[PDB]
């Protein structure tokens, strides 16, 4: 929305991964920063990891 806020939205989502512990989500944040074009991939990986580590 508004513009290409892909970076922002991906960053916010990766932060708000309640099942991930700090090191993992921080890892994905650094991956986002390093690979800005790959924010979609980084987000995908983060969400998949969060899902797999879900308590149930």
Domains in the chain (CATH in brackets) are 1-56 (1.20.5.420)
Cβ proximity of 13 and 46 under 8 Å: yes
**Beta carbons of 13 and 29 less than 8 angstroms apart:** no
Nearest one of 56, 2, 48 to 25, comparing CA atoms: 48
CB count within 10 Å of CB 14 equals: 24
Give the total residue count for the chain: 56
- Residues 35, 42: contact at Cβ < 8 Å? yes
CB 42 within 8 A of CB 28: yes
Tokens 């290409």 -> residue: 4
Contact indicator for 3, 28 with CB cutoff of 8 Å: no
Could you tell me which residues come within 8 angstroms of residue 49 by beta carbon, excluding any fewer than 6 positions away? 17, 20, 24, 28
Structure-determination approach: NMR
């Amino acid at each position: 929305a508004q513009h290409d806020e892909a970076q922002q939205n991906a960053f916010y989502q990766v932060l708000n991964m309640p099942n991930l512990n700090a090191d993992q989500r921080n890892g994905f944040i650094q991956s986002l920063k390093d690979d800005p074009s790959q924010s979609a991939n980084v987000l995908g990986e983060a969400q998949k990891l969060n899902d797999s580590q879900a308590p149930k």
